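Here we describe the complex-level prediction in full. Unlike the single-chain runs in Section 2.1, the three entities below were treated as one system.
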Amino acid sequence: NQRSSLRIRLFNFSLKLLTCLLYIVRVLLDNKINWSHIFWVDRKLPLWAVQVSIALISFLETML
Amino acid sequence: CLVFTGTCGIQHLERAGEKLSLFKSFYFCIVTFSTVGYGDVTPKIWPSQLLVVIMICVALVVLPLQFEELVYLWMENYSR
Amino acid sequence: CLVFTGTCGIQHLERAGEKLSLFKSFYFCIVTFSTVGYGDVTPKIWPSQLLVVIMICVALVVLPLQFEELVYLWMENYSR
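The structure predicted for the assembly as a whole is:
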């Protein structure tokens, strides 16, 4: 299809916009070679939950 | 897209040594791909240098291939 | 024309932090578009960086299009 194929790519496109733009906000709030600050990083819980839901949709889009 | 990836990784690594902001990192990243080389803001960490080298290496792969593909089309009507 | 615009805005912004002259700013501006990257004179302010990035971004738009348009004519008589 031409119409329906354009919508699923728009959904997968605009989903991946949100995850990148949500990553900007959590960086703005969080604040020897320290690997403490590199990996163990207190990401926000409400902004984490939206990133997981987008990940589950895009994981299922690859499965389909 | 490559500009955003550099600003993420460098700033995230820079939390260990000299806390740069997104504003200060975006200045540094777009400078490195434009090839000015200010070096006023710099990576002062073992993995931060390791990334910034890879950012420049990945930039050397991308930039010349995109400019050549643009001029390929540029070489070769009435509107509504 | 783009050289004058950079020297205006940067020097005007630099009155807030480290007062540069027109002589010192013209050195910095023509260095950034030639792509040497000295960084001895630098922008040390929130909007000064924001401009200098846009100066380099606007330079990336202009410079390659002007060089390509020059070589386009250069590829293709007796005086009075």
